[PDB]
Amino acid sequence: TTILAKYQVKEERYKLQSKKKLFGLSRSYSLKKYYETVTKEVDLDFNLAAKFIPVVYGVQKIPGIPIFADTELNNPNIVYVVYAFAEGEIDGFLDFYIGDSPMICFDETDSDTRTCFGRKKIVGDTMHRLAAGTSTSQPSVHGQEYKYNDGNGDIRIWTFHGKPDQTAAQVLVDIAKKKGFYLQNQNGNGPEYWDSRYKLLDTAYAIVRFTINENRTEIPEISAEVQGKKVKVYNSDGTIKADKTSLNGIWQLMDYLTSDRYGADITLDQFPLQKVISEAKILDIIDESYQTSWQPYWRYVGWNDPLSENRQIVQLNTILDTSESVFKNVQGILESFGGAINNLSGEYRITVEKYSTNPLRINFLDTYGDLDLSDTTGRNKFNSVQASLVDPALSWKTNSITFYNSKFKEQDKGLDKKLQLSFANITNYYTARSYADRELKKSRYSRTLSFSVPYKFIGIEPNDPIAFTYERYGWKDKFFLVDEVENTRDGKINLVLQEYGEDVFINSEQVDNSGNDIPDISNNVLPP
Amino acid sequence: MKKILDSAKNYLNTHDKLKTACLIALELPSSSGSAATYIYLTDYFRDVTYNGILYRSGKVKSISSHKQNRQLSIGSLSFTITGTAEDEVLKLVQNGVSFLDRGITIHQAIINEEGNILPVDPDTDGPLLFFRGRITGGGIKDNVNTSGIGTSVITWNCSNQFYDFDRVNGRYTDDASHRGLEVVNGTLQPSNGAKRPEYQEDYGFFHSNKSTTILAKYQVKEERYKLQSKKKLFGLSRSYSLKKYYETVTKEVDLDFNLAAKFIPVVYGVQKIPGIPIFADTELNNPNIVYVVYAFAEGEIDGFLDFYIGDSPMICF
Amino acid sequence: TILDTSESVFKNVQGILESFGGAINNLSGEYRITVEKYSTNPLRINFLDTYGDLDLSDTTGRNKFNSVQASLVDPALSWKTNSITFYNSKFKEQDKGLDKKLQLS
Amino acid sequence: ASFRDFASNNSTAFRDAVELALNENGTTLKSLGNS
Amino acid sequence: ASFRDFASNNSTAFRDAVELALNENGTTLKSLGNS
Amino acid sequence: ASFRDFASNNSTAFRDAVELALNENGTTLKSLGNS
Amino acid sequence: MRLPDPYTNPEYPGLGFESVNLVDNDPMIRDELPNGKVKEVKISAQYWGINISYPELFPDEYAFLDSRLLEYKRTGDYLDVLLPQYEAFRVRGDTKSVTIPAGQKGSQIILNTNGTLTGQPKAGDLFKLSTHPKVYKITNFSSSGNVWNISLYPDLFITTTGSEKPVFNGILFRTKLMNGDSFGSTLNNNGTYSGISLSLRESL
Prior knowledge:
This is part of a larger assembly, with 3 copies of chain A, 3 copies of chain D and 1 copy of chain G.
Chain A: H1 2-5, E1 16-17, H2 31-37, E2 41-42, E3 55-63, E4 65-71, E5 78-84, E6 93-97, H3 108-111, H4 129-132, E7 147-149, E8 154-156, E9 159-160, H5 170-177, H6 182-186, E10 205-211, E11 223-228, E12 233-234, E13 240-241, H7 249-257, H8 273-283, E14 318-320, H9 326-333, E15 341-342, E16 349-350, E17 360-363, E18 370-374, E19 384-391, E20 397-404, H10 406-410, E21 418-420, H11 429-443, E22 448-453, E23 465-469, E24 478-487, E25 493-499
Parallel strand pairs in A: 17-23, 19-21
Antiparallel strand pairs in A: 1-2, 3-11, 3-14, 4-5, 5-10, 6-11, 7-8, 8-10, 9-10, 12-13, 15-16, 18-22, 19-20, 22-25, 23-24, 24-25
Chain D: H1 3-8, H2 11-22
Chain G: E1 19-25, E2 28-32, E3 38-41, E4 47-53, H1 59-75, E5 79-81, E6 108-112, E7 126-129, E8 135-144, E9 147-152, E10 166-167, E11 173-177, E12 186-187, E13 193-194, E14 197-202
Antiparallel strand pairs in G: 1-4, 2-3, 4-14, 5-11, 6-9, 7-8, 7-10, 8-9, 11-14, 12-13
Main location (chain G): virion
Subcellular location (chain G): Virion
Organism (chain G): Escherichia phage T5 (Enterobacteria phage T5)
């Protein structure tokens, strides 16, 4: 960092962008406090939490942490600096932000303001277009060199993906072999300055080479859009597919939970594969509210082929700031798709909210006689929702999703009550809108029920469908979802049910926001 | 000091055995907002007629204690119905019914020797008010004992207008929120969610999303996406410490990740506030002439006293 | 005053109060605004008119101060912060010269 | 006395009873996850 | 047991009893309004 | 009632019983010294 | 199983109830309204409770009794008892040819003897269905020729399926012991077990 600071502006001398901008708005925060806490850049001279390596699932933008910086001996204005992006075996780098302008320009509007290649809108061009020269929409290649000249200087990247068995970069080894590094000669070091031991295992990085000259007099802040760590997707038959990253939340959580390198080391033994596989398909249900054609930034929202469906109900492109606690990281991965880690009955069970046509029928005469109804309509029932997300349609800025409901305001005597939300791991606008609509629908059912059942009915777990039937009330097979379950050693099970509805899980039709994208074509000098 | 009639001041001083009844009048939780049905109830053993309204008896069991401090707080009250009426049970446990903003008024009535209401409140020449607020909550507690006597208690929860302390009522600078847009069949049509019915054809905040990015072109590299904090000092109480309080105070906020900086403030008296851009565009044949619109404050203001072009006001000190 | 509307209604009301005293009261039906004041005809309560219980509690520590220091946004400056600080010789003659400062904003 | 053991067997009730007096004003105990 | 109802009828006492053990050190419960 | 005096004589037990239900999740009462 | 008694084992006359307490246990959600009206809701099932007290038991009789009780505690089944005060054989005949039409719920019941039974079951006597083990109590009787209309205190637990047969004699309560946890017997110097008593309770 100190060596790199010499080739930077007085400002941004010792600074780095925050890895995660939005993290999640819950009852632990207030609107003012939550939106004031979000930071853009952190100083590296007093923030030891900014030097932790993040892990990315899906297409997300992350800053690069320098780990090496040195110039050539006889060409001191050529500086090699190494930035470590992300953790684990990533699919590749989609694009590189040299300053605040990506190498692949957004659309026609950004093309007429600077020297750029390809289009990120509709076409979905990727960085590999720099080497191939054709229209390519797939990530970089491990260890391949890319040449980018925008007219102000030459920049070469040498993208490296994470691998368990990486070899040392040949370019840096070759330079260090001939005593080519300036500070290597200054301090008298030999070939050991950079050697075959410099493997950098399990860490993706890029060796960006700068040619500082009359025009690019400073090293701009480097950021990249990675595609994320590959995850193991388990199939029902038994085969194991781990070749690409997955947007499914359950697979991302399973990867985070079974990794002893980052996170907790929960072995695959302590997991029922069939239950997890069945629950993944719940998040894999195709949504029919919007059309695939309505998303022009298809490549940069996690999708890989516009022809395919790519219309899953919940899709997550997440950044996990590894400097956080494991408990808080898991708690943040959940609450983005529902989810409830359960340690009952031995294994770790992942359960998500769902509707079933064959729930378990509990009559009140099957209980122990106690019953507590509690509906807190105040503080929990809302008529409209306002959400925010980091949308790649903009320059990874925040976009607000706001809509009202005329039926819910016709009810409640026209009272104005707004639900405030913020999605951290969702980047697709339509998915975020659907999730906000689901939360707004789910807020209208605020009524819980608690009772105890005998040892029989053993096996009840949270987020299970149960039909309650108490003839004294007007209840005949009323839909409930388990919220609290307690098992005693004397064969008594205490339950707390949460009321739900069928309408919660149907998707309302929406319109396309494809024409309301605002690329940041500023921050650069316009040509004559 | 809630003044009391001198006539009541004699009865409350001479008579020792006072027969008091609490007259409850709660709005029925209804599925829709149409009409306004009221259930009138009393704690007395016989029905009590007040202003021609028969407050029927036999349902209410107990009422809680209304406490009010000198610190702002929700005023919670809890009155319980029998729970074995089986006509009040269905109203509470009905499906698809909401009582988010249903009110309740409770009177404190004193009965005379002849069975009438002793006038106390001077303005109304009737009984006092015990509590008037909103219904926020509820529940029923069934307890079936396998040997003995079981009990069931329906408890309604009440509070004042500030029950939802985590509620942000504000006009966020956006078209979708200002006009209350909602998809009806296949288009985003304005609805009744707008604070006024005349807001449905107001396109003032139409170009507010791109105003900041367009404006940033004509600014310094710093202050590119920034805005001054609307309120600098907010108040030092026992909830803060000196160091924390004076470190929290901020001068400028970034507009690309602070959605709370796009809310419209309300100003009483002479105060300095920043302007939130809602439109910015140049002329066609004179591109160096740029029109930018800043929305200062809310409501009918008296006027603008001065404008700070940069950090220097137009009218010098 | 400036009311940052992004705040909650509850907190905005709680902040408008405590600037002039004030206590919103929902007792006796209506909303009543009461401020601290002195009266020459207060209501006379004798202890024999009570129910017999009585609790006296004086927390002089953590609540009694001899001097005050406050701050405000003063338009005399360029809307910057100005500090108002003054002492009291009588209150420090009492309390055996202890230095205790009240901090306000 | 032996009250500690008991309270340790009814902790959630204590938490709820505490959070029920802080909600009188705008304070709540779910604001500790930030810190 | 039936202790929950009781505690819900004496919440302010619980709040005060809690804040009386946090004042031993410099902690107090009035520092939640910020968050 | 006379429960206030008692609770004021057993405050530390209340504090511990509270902090024992907040540790179920990741919350704890030692995060008030910051504020 | 069967609780031993002088009818099953006449060689042990010490067995046999010195005093039997047939209690009625119907839990109810009773509520006393402020207006004077008392409202009670029946939800929990009703169950007869039987408190049996034994006279001075000699060692062999107590050996038989506690052997049977310990067999009960071992195999875990139910313990049937036959109250003798309700053993007045007031209805002769065989009840197999008596049909109870299906689809009947509530206290009332209609059964057709088809001219088979001789004797009228007066109010206060016991009644029990062939299939279900619940024991009812006749409160009123009215017959029009062969058809009998009987009103029972506890509502019919199960709706008649058209095959249940009336049982007007030899009615056994399917009970469970409630003194099992701590059941002691004292032996006097006279040679008899004194103060042997049972607190039974009908199950289901």
